[PDB]
Design a protein around this ligand. Structure first.
Ligand SMILES: CNc1nc2sc3c(N4CCN([C@@H]5O[C@H](C(=O)O)[C@@H](O)[C@H](O)[C@H]5O)CC4)nnnc3c2c2c1CCCC2
Ligand SMILES: CNc1nc2sc3c(N4CCN([C@@H]5O[C@H](C(=O)O)[C@@H](O)[C@H](O)[C@H]5O)CC4)nnnc3c2c2c1CCCC2
Ligand SMILES: CNc1nc2sc3c(N4CCNCC4)nnnc3c2c2c1CCCC2
Ligand SMILES: CNc1nc2sc3c(N4CCNCC4)nnnc3c2c2c1CCCC2
Lengths: 580, 580
């Protein structure tokens, strides 16, 4: 369980972000005890941020192995009173915290938070904090390092690493709040729908009371109970592009924490994805925590810029593509009313492109245990987010291979059981699968395709490509379930133009999406269009990557390609609800 | 006096940065008491960052007037023990802090820090912090708003405003450290130069002792005295591109603060700018705190990227162009060994381009009082920075007009008297002045020109332009002083190319700098070449601005133009010292 550190009367918060000392491991790093003494001949390195692009030459950009972040720490003795904790929101890949020279914590997983307490190794005076980060990826990591001394991603984005998100120090009373959970039942029956919310607070280390406020701070109800309930008639339902967030003050044993919460219902019904009992239609794109020169590092300004562009463009949703995003971005979609598809680090679980099969148990992937710890850690983190309407177990696994069904079912189950809101589960299907062959047809509530008819398939022949896409999508309808496209797009170099289009031209990109959009619009069970990608992003080099991935509607610096004006006009004529 | 808030055994630091509530004033804002209640129908807005580009449409970008930032605050009662302070590192233009509804502080000046104490209005529970920001610029602001309801900058950059730099909360013992000062005397005579540093600590609200450490934390000397001294034989001299920073722990009355410091000497001698008694040569550029979509907002990653590019390019210096930069960037140049020319907000003090004269006292500028408070606040902030080797009182004032000399002398004097290191003073001369006509010839230790022979003057005729530049620079030598160019450049659209160059082409830009660089190299009293600009940046719209200022060597996203490879080759063959 991981609550978002905030400033409360009961808890303090001090950011450690800034320029830290930094050294690339030379192999002999751990041998000598760098985590013991202050790094020598060190380099400077802002935190929070990916370090790959922040220096010059390939030696930083393409480093294999470990790096050492190092910074000094010092708390006021008058604080030992309360509990001292170190929250690392995300260290890409493996983290190893040393204080004063001793290991204190260790973590696997580059995109989710982890904490460690400091009360009993926090010395007096100036303490030597050391965070060593490893970037190696393999068949035991999610995301999955392939075989082709260098990391070779089995995924189409660059392997940005370092202290990707912030490192803070918060405190707490000795017995504290540790995990608040809230769910809602809404009775749309009444012409003025109302709702009953179920609280479930948890403490560790006494009386606990719950206060419920409205948008403006107006209190409206109170109760006591580490597992009580609450009633709200004439309830302001959170809605896509129309967020309403209540707030919640849990006072419990000299400790109080506040939580926003939006009241809405998610439910699949036949070929309809329903939000607050209405037939939604996804409009938006798959995104990437990718900016220059931050790498995958957190970027509050671009977060707001990205959401400003989405509203300008008349979109309503995005998918945390290939990894969970920052907590800040998740809260922002709550405030702004952005429907989010929250997705795990499970990309590259596919060895298809003697031959080893993906789910061979001696020579194939070794990810299921960690895949489970991710599903749990992620749902623990974002369970209370009204923006989250669905979960994505994995992006493009070899889901039509043998071993496939056996791999994923234990993970779907774990997901369906750990979501206090029992939200729809899916996985994003790669090109090649079909209704009959895809283990997703059974395990998933929503069929999410990534199809590229007009690019990989059939490009530059958009007629032949249309025939293919009708044929395949037609078949997908026989499952009687909601199907949305989570990726489709074409690599386009901003600036390349032509009257009779050729591939890579802004005109070819617009035509591609006209064909796909025409076919989408023929099937009432298509409940979503999400283009890949929102914006150009960095990938590993290869002959097929024109200085990265150029499938964005926008450039890496958020300037619109012609296609961005095509979608803005199309999405403006398509409602959040009732499109079918 | 303003010390950089850091984490010490005696003091805590909690960042307030994040997504704050935000509303554009509609005129009726102050009338109604928005600073009293929680903003209603608010918008989201990251802090720290300029807000102009973070939303869509001209209504944010071009707002005239006030905006309201608003966030909730809550400290742990167990802190009232110590002093509570709110440090606003920079609110562009005018700031007005309200707590719980009461004004607590007010500030003028968009680029320097200001604080306010909270102990006696900091309520218990959740407090409503409100920061109202004004963007209006006029003859009473530095920088100077011109006459041509809209702000019209009399300066060539966009009027980015909002909470430009971070807002934090630190604490202190009741009697505390308030301003440490250190100076150095070096005896280059000895073949192993040594040095004696003079401490000068200050407290407010007891024993105080000073500890001196070396790079790696090795203590090396101790003493007691709020105005004592210190001795260091075999001293590691801070040097351009070879920084050595000692550290300093001032323990005083249950309060301790640490300070880095580099030992170096700055001294002009004839036509030689001497650092550690050696003839330096400035290599670098004028920069701008300008990134997308941050605006003028702080950007730790780009700060490190910018400094990585400078070392890649073989530069040694930059000028805080048109305003002081963040404290973080200033400390970074200390660590990295970047020579900095620290400059004030005093740009647009020039009405030349019945006619009013700049320094008319009824109808011209009204900036001298504030100009003084800036010189003092700035030197108070950066006095201890080894990277700072010079001060810039103003960028391109009408320095050859009547009233000119009378305006600036009181400011030069105030500057020369308040710098504990008695560092060189200058002002950057606009095109048009000459040795005879420029009040800078007398008041300044270094003549700093901004010339544009090859662009504004003479372009596209580089021959005629060379004749002009030789003629003018020749004359400037008669003053027997060091002269460096702080700006020269040509607007260049990355991507426009030609074999026979035309203006705006990457080839014309390279040729421009070849001509100017050839002439520079003829005069041994030219001690510096700093190109304008390091990178493309945003300006107000006009027929002469091709989507901003395109004079960068790099694009706004830090990608090199051809000229960036020309300088990197040239600067690699030119030493920091002894070039003449
Ligand atoms: C019609 N038959 C084909 N089908 C396919 S599928 C495929 C392929 N994957 C697709 C799916 N993406 C997904 O989409 C995005 C992207 O690819 O840009 C990624 O960014 C994103 O992370 C990822 O989710 C990951 C990788 N990569 N390369 N070639 C192909 C290929 C080809 C053909 C025909 C021969 C030429 C190649
Ligand atoms: C040879 N005779 C001329 N001399 C000059 S001088 C001038 C002018 N200033 C120069 C100086 N900059 C400075 O340099 C940068 C820049 O200009 O880009 C600015 O970014 C930077 O902030 C600022 O410090 C500020 C503004 N602006 N426009 N025209 C001219 C002009 C012209 C002519 C001939 C006719 C055409 C125009
Ligand atoms: C794991 N992600 C992928 N998935 C796929 S699918 C497919 C294909 N098709 C699919 C349709 N059926 C006929 C054959 N042809 N070539 N490459 C691919 C392909 C690739 C990758 C990534 C590596 C590069 C190629
Ligand atoms: C305050 N900054 C400026 N300074 C200058 S100087 C000059 C010039 N020259 C100078 C050389 N002597 C002959 C006349 N011609 N046109 N515009 C200018 C000019 C301008 C500005 C800014 C406003 C736009 C024009």
């Amino acid at each position: 369980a991981m609550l978002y550190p905030v400033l409360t009367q009961s808890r303090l918060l001090s950011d450690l972000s800034g320029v830290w000392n930094f050294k690339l491991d030379n192999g002999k790093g751990f041998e000598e005890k760098w985590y013991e003494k202050p790094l020598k001949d060190a380099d400077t390195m802002p935190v929070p941020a990916s370090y790959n692009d922040l220096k010059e030459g390939t030696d930083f950009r393409d480093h294999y192995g470990w790096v050492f972040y190092q910074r000094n720490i010092s708390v006021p003795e008058y604080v030992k009173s309360q509990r001292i904790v170190l929250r690392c929101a995300a260290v890409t890949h493996y983290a190893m915290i040393y204080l004063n020279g001793k290991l204190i914590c260790e973590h696997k997983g580059g995109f989710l938070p982890f904490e460690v307490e400091l009360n009993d190794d926090l010395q007096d005076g100036d303490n030597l904090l050391t965070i060593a980060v490893n970037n190696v990826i393999d068949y035991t990591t999610l995301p999955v390092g392939g075989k082709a001394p260098q990391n070779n991603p089995n995924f189409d984005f660059f392997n940005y690493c370092g202290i990707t998100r912030p490192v803070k120090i918060y405190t707490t009373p000795e017995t504290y709040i540790n995990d608040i959970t809230v769910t809602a039942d809404i009775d749309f029956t009444k012409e003025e729908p109302s709702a009953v919310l179920n609280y479930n607070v948890e403490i560790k280390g006494i009386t606990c009371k719950v206060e419920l406020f409205d948008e403006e701070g107006t209190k409206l109800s109170e109760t006591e109970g580490s597992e009580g309930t609450f009633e709200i008639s004439n309830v302001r339902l959170w809605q896509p592009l129309n967020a309403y967030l209540y707030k919640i003050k849990v006072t419990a044993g000299q400790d109080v924490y506040t939580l926003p919460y939006g009241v809405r219902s998610v439910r699949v019904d036949g070929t309809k994805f329903l939000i607050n009992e209405k037939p939604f239609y996804f409009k938006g794109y798959g995104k990437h925590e990718d900016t220059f020169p931050n790498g995958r590092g957190i970027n509050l300004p671009m977060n707001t810029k990205d959401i400003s562009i989405m509203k300008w463009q008349h979109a309503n949703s995005f998918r945390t593509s290939h990894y969970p995003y920052s907590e800040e971005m998740m809260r922002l979609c709550d405030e702004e009313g952005i429907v989010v598809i929250d997705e795990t680090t499970a990309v590259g679980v596919n060895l298809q492109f003697e031959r080893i099969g993906t789910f061979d148990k001696e020579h194939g992937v070794q990810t299921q245990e960690h895949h489970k710890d991710v599903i749990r850690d992620l749902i623990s983190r974002d369970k209370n987010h009204a923006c989250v309407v669905m979960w994505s177990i994995a992006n493009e696994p070899d889901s039509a291979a043998e071993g496939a069904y056996d791999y994923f079912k234990p993970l779907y189950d774990l997901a369906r059981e750990l979501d206090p809101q029992k939200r729809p589960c899916t996985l994003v299907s790669v090109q090649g699968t079909t209704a009959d062959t895809d283990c997703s047809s059974q395990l998933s509530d929503v069929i999410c395709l990534n199809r590229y008819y007009g690019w990989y398939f059939g490009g530059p022949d958009l007629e032949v490509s249309e025939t293919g896409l009708r044929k395949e999508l037609s078949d997908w309808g026989k499952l009687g379930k909601p199907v949305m496209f989570t990726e489709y797009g074409a690599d386009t170099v901003s600036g390349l133009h032509d009257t009779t289009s050729v591939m890579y031209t802004e005109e070819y990109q617009v035509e591609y999406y006209e064909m796909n959009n025409k076919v989408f619009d023929e099937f009432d069970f298509v409940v979503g269009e999400q283009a890949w990608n929102f914006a150009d992003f960095a990938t590993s080099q290869s002959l097929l990557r024109v200085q990265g991935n150029k499938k964005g509607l926008f450039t890496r610096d958020r300037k619109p390609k012609m296609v961005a004006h095509y979608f803005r006009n199309r999405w403006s004529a398509i409602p959040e609800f009732g499109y079918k």
